[PDB]
């Protein structure tokens, strides 16, 4: 349809995979979508919803984020850069939230999921804020199997962009909580090669990346371009073979097409 959508099609064509993009420009609330209503495995981008759900709980429990949580040797999963330092000790929910969002610590995510009563608790929060698409079905690390055609642990680009806007720029969360989420996202350590690699350096942003089997490579971001209203951008990418390599460069390419199209 659009020129931007045509460029994204061309990128996808030589990418060797399936690309999903959703942009919301809050300057005018317009949207640009590519496979915007197709489902994609969220992988680590799902951590944003879990952290936000705990932030929502903290609105009625002022000391919740300071609540200690025991980390046991058995809790360690496949990637736990922060939690492994606290085995046989504790981490507060604020620490687990920061670890999950900024380092993609999987043990930390599992603690957030447990605090919400299981994967379904994350889905329940999504529904409460108006997201009828998002679904979390499993814990770390199996929520990242990313099997083609599998509806578990998926969402669509359109749905995730709308929810990320509501969480970071809208009123899904209380003012203090919304600010805390944005602060964590802006402090992410894993996104320089993804959406942000395709944006002008002056533009500041916060994001959450994701990687899974099938060469799944994702990123969701809130962007503050120089001189204009913020943008919310989601880029999902998945490939045909289970052992496919990550392609963060495809996400950066998509982001560049979006930026040049503004």
194 is catalytic: no
- Interhelix angle 175-186/47-58, nearest 10 degrees: 150
DSSP symbol at 16: T
- DSSP assignments along 188-243, one per residue: -SS-TTTGGGGS-TTSEEEEEEEEETTTEEEEEEEEE-TTS--EEEEEEEE-SSTT
Resolution in A for the shown PDB structure?
1.7
Q: How many domains does one find in the chain?
A: 1
Phi-psi region of 175 (alpha: psi -120 to 50; beta: other; left: phi over 0): alpha
| Torsion angle defined by CA atoms of residues 78, 83, 85 and 87, in that order, rounded to the nearest 10 degrees | -90
Structural domain span for residue 133 = 1-262
Name every residue whose Cβ is closer than 8 Å to that of residue 116 and which is 6 or more positions away in sequence.
Answer: 50, 53, 54, 57, 122, 124, 125
Out of 14, 15, 44, 211, pick the active-site residue: 44
CATH number assigned to the domain comprising residue 60? 3.40.710.10
């Amino acid at each position: 349809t659009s020129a931007v959508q045509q460029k994204l099609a061309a990128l996808e064509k030589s990418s060797g995979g399936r690309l999903g993009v959703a942009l919301i420009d809050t300057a005018d609330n317009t949207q640009v979508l590519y496979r915007g209503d197709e489902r994609f495995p969220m992988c680590s981008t799902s951590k944003v919803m879990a952290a936000a759900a705990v932030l929502k709980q903290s609105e009625t429990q002022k000391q919740l984020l300071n609540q200690p949580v025991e980390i046991k040797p058995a809790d360690l999963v496949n990637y736990n850069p922060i939690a492994e330092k606290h085995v046989n000790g504790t981490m507060t929910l604020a620490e687990l939230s920061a670890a999950a969002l900024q380092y993609s610590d999987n043990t930390a995510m599992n603690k957030l999921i447990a605090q919400l009563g299981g994967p379904g608790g994350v889905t329940a929060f999504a529904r409460a804020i108006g997201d009828e698409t998002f679904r979390l079905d499993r814990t770390e690390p199996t929520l990242n199997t990313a099997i083609p055609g599998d509806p578990r642990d998926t969402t669509t680009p359109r749905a995730m962009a709308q929810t990320l806007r509501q969480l970071t720029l809208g009123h899904a969360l209380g003012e203090t909580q919304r600010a805390q989420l944005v602060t964590w996202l802006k402090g992410n350590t894993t996104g320089a090669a993804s959406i942000r690699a395709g944006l002008p350096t002056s533009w500041t942003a916060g994001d959450k990346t994701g990687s899974g089997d099938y060469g799944t490579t994702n990123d969701i971001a809130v962007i503050w371009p120089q001189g204009r209203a913020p943008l919310v951008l989601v880029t999902y990418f998945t490939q045909p073979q289970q052992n496919a390599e990550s392609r963060r460069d495809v996400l950066a390419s998509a982001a560049r097409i979006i930026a040049e199209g503004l």
